[PDB]
Every structure is written in structure tokens, then in C-alpha cells.
Amino acid sequence: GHMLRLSAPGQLDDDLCLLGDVQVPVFLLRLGEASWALVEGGISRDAELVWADLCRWVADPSQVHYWLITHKHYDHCGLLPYLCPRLPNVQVLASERTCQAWKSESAVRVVERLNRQLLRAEQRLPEACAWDALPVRAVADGEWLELGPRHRLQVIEAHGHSDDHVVFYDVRRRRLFCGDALGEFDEAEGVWRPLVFDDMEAYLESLERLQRLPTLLQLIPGHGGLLRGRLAADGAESAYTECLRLCRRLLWRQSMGESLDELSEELHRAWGGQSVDFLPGELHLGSMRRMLEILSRQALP
Ligand SMILES: O=C(O)c1ccccc1-n1cccc1
Ligand SMILES: [Fe+3]
Ligand SMILES: [Fe+3]
Numbered sequence: 001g002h003m004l005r006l007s008a009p010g011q012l013d014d015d016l017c018l019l020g021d022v023q024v025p026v027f028l029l030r031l032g033e034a035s036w037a038l039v040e041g042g043i044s045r046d047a048e049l050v051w052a053d054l055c056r057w058v059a060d061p062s063q064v065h066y067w068l069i070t071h072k073h074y075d076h077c078g079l080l081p082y083l084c085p086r087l088p089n090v091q092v093l094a095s096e097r098t099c100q101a102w103k104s105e106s107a108v109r110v111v112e113r114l115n116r117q118l119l120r121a122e123q124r125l126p127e128a129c130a131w132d133a134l135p136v137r138a139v140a141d142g143e144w145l146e147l148g149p150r151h152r153l154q155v156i157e158a159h160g161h162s163d164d165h166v167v168f169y170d171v172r173r174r175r176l177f178c179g180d181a182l183g184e185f186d187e188a189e190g191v192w193r194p195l196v197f198d199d200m201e202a203y204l205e206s207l208e209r210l211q212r213l214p215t216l217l218q219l220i221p222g223h224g225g226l227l228r229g230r231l232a233a234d235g236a237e238s239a240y241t242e243c244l245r246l247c248r249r250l251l252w253r254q255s256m257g258e259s260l261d262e263l264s265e266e267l268h269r270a271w272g273g274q275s276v277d278f279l280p281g282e283l284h285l286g287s288m289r290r291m292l293e294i295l296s297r298q299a300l301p
Contacts, residue, residue: 007225019053031148037066044078044115069094070179071165072101074114081128097164160203174217182239210236
């Protein structure tokens with residue numbers, strides 16, 4: 001409950017609504033009187049929740065024409081096979097690499113595995129479309145997405161968190177759908193938690209490019225809701241600072257003979273509580289481990 005953070009389902013702006021759970025939300029954009037779009041692909045088990053929320057705003061689901069995806073992680077595309085059947089006119093917009101992940105049986109295997117762990121006991125999933133059969137359209141870095149007469153979003157490559165990650169910038173509204181590129185926003189402390197799970201140099205380089213965007217009014221990550229005011233304006237820069245802060249912290253620990261597992265457990269214990277309801281505890285601890293391993297390699301003797 002903060003002035004600068006909208007974290008409740010429902011309407012966020014004149015054109016924007018939050019569907020489903022705030023920790024893994026799906027955002028709804030009204031492009032016109034009979035045209036809508038979705039942003040972020042959530043987790044599979046939320047199919048019926050998101051669908052329920054959606055139908056309360058969209059009388060005719062055939063008016064959903066676009067579904068924008070930031071990256072291939074299980075918590076950002078798990079809904080696609082299960083709701084695309086119910087969205088006959090939708091077109092999934094994703095980066096080339098993100099599309100490649102859906103044509104890989106091994107990559108799909110991991111996405112499905114992690115999502116099934118989040119299923120409640122006796123919970124059944126709808127009739128699902130084949131991952132390789134999704135109505136996808138690959139988008140490239142810098143491409144402009146003419147979604148509607150008042151919605152023009154630019155695709156900006158933002159690798160680092162993952163090797164396929166992109167973000168979507170609505171310059172008209174100074175609004176950035178940044179996915180996980182800035183990390184995980186700490187709701188209790190008001191700072192960003194870095195999520196460097198692929199490449200640190202690219203991670204920092206992406207934040208440098210995003211800092212050069214015109215001053216943001218709304219910052220919408222993959223988890224936690226909508227950020228505004230100074231949080232949006234300073235977002236990219238603050239996320240950059242917090243990443244370096246974690247690096248220096250890592251170097252300090254290692255220089256004291258500490259093993260990566262020592263700080264991993266500490267990060268997991270201090271940060272794993274926010275994502276417990278949609279992220280298996282072993283995945284978070286392992287993710288923290290993978291991150292520190294990345295930072296150690298790209299900053300060590
Ligand atoms: O990206 C995240 O949302 C995330 C955050 C914390 C730990 C693991 C994560 N993860 C890694 C791969 C898919 C989820
Ligand atoms: Fe992610
Ligand atoms: Fe994520």
C-alpha cells in the first residue's frame with residue numbers, strides 16, 4: 001500500500017488493467033472500443049483466474065488481437081497454450097529467440113515442468129495448444145508495434161536477465177513494460193533486487209540503454225504491479241546501482257574466504273519469500289546461486 005506503487009487487480013489507468021495475481025500479473029490494454037491487447041504471459045495454473053478477470057472487461061474475447069511477451073521464462077509465457085485457444089484472433093508478439101524456445105522440446109519441457117509444480121492439488125488445466133502451434137509473430141529490436149491509433153510500442157532488446165529478453169516502450173505515455181530486466185522490486189524496502197541469470201555485462205548494458213529513454217512516468221515490471229513517480233523515473237538507474245552493489249557485496253564475501261553457497265543461502269532467505277507462491281524454493285536458491293556464479297566469473301581474478 002504505497003502512493004507510488006499500484007498493486008491491486010483491476011483498472012490501473014484509463015487504458016490499462018491488471019489481471020490475475022499481482023505477483024505474476026497479465027496486463028490488459030484497451031486499443032479501441034472493440035480491440036484489446038495483453039502483455040506478459042504469466043503462469044499456467046492462473047489460466048482460469050486470468051480468463052475470469054479478462055471476461056469481466058472484454059465482452060467478446062475475439063477482440064483480443066495481440067499478446068506481448070517479454071521473455072521465455074516459465075512465469076512469463078505459461079498461459080499461452082491454455083488461453084490462446086480461447087482467443088481466436090490473438091497474435092503473440094515475441095522476440096526471435098523467445099520464439100525459438102517454443103520450438104525446442106527441451107526448452108518447452110522445462111517450462112511445463114516448473115508450471116506443473118505450481119498446480120494446486122486436483123487442479124485441471126484447459127485444452128492446451130501445442131507450443132509449436134502458437135499464433136506467434138517474431139518481432140525485432142527497435143521495431144514499432146502499431147497496436148492501435150493511440151498505442152504505439154517499441155521493441156527494445158534488453159538481454160542479461162535472459163538471452164532473449166525484450167521490453168516494450170509506450171513513448172506516448174512514458175510507459176515501459178520492463179519484465180525482469182531491472183530485477184525484482186522489493187516491496188518492503190523499495191529497492192530493486194537484481195536478477196542476473198544469463199549475462200551480467202549485457203544486463204548492465206541493457207539498463208544503460210534504458211536509462212537513456214525519455215523520463216518514464218510508469219514502470220511496469222514482470223512482478224509486483226505498476227510503479228510511478230520517482231520509482232519510474234529513477235528505475236533503470238536504481239536497478240543499475242543495486243546490481244553493482246550486489247557485485248561489491250559478493251567480492252567482499254569471497255575475499256573473506258566465503259563460498260558462493262554462503263551468500264546464496266542468505267539471499268534466498270532474505271529474498272525468496274516474495275516469490276514463494278509462484279516459484280519453487282529450490283528454483284530461487286538455485287537462481288541465486290546461478291546469479292552469484294555469473295557475477296563471480298565476470299568480476300574476479
Ligand atoms: O525471473 C524470475 O522471475 C526469477 C526470480 C527469482 C528467482 C528465479 C527466477 N526465475 C528464473 C527463471 C525463471 C524464474
Ligand atoms: Fe524471468
Ligand atoms: Fe520472472
